[PDB]
Amino acid sequence: LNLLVIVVDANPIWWGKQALKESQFTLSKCIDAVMVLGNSHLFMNRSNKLAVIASHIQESRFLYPGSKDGKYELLTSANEVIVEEIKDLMTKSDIKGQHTETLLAGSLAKALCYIHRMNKEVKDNQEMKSRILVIKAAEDSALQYMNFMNVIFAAQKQNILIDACVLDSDSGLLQQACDITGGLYLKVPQMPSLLQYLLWVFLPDQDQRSQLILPPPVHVDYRAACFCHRNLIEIGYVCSVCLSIFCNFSPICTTCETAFKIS
Template structure:
């Protein structure tokens, strides 16, 4: 909330969207379905403490939606995978809709910040990479603030789109890192002393087992990646011609003529 409030307070034309991603679904926290362009109900007019009304509405809606998600979500097992690719796709769709509603001649500079505490899921590799390249085509930066283990997928996303990747060393300082590293836009970042870029893990996930691999086999037709060789591509069903070793013909022995 501190990050969102600071972003909207930087400029009155700034817009904010917050999406929650968990193991079963991804949904908007703000703006939510119950909020329509400033219709925040009784909270919209509650400015007795001198707070900017829009910030008060956003904080209340985000907190309410978070409580609803936590009460409806069923935790199964110890898996921490989230539907991150779906959340990023929703963010791109929202940005596209906002840009379409802009006046003619006005442009919007959009960026996506991912605050991640879950582990990577190789099953989402294809969808994730499609979202990354879609963001790159639309000139949308993807930043990543990682709280737990390193994320190779987000490293690739930040490197491809020109965003920042940071695994914070201390979770207690999360708000400080958000305001220092991720709040400034791309133009302001060039004037700041930011953490050095990390080494990007560009391993790809195989299509057969969804495991991250360093060396594999690539289909020359559909570019699918496999960890083991197969004479038939399971994606496009292309049959590969396997070169057979040349058979060396045995030399015929010359018959010795008797004299």
């Protein structure tokens, strides 16, 4: 079976900027597209299961743990729960000018441990191939690099595919993240037609991904820079404690304070 997790980056600052701009695309339509993708994923098979996470500057919250219109009961419950919870989360939110960058590493950590919990609980008879369909919507924060890299490596070890679906911006950190675990990287330039991209590129599971034509991966610039002025460097002088990429040979690296002996 397959356990899909949609990590939606519903950043109020950026999505409300779109709302003020009165652009055609809106967070409501984005949530509807994600809902349709999840419904289709579960539609694929009974054993398949899904979950949803929404990201905010403060924290990240799960959007998912009759036939009034002649509807499938389970998908109806999914629609109702996600709609109600997303509206509640968006309506209620404190204001903090100091912190405005969208948070994604914590949401991904929650997704990873949730997948681990489900893998533990599920019977050993059936093998579960989990996936994380990250949908970024705003620029990333520099200060989150370390934790995001930790969670990416944990996902690599635990065999989960991070399929990035960044839109309106190309996050180098996120493309690097999905490249490590082999997840696909699609940058949709046509936001209104986003759902067609999901039902082709992302929706097919790892089982059938190899035996299918999908957009080629984007080249990843594995840049390195010294800790002084933040610029690309091809040669780094790291020590045996900090393991920090530096500018030039120095008597002692500041982040270490070690008694380096010249020679």
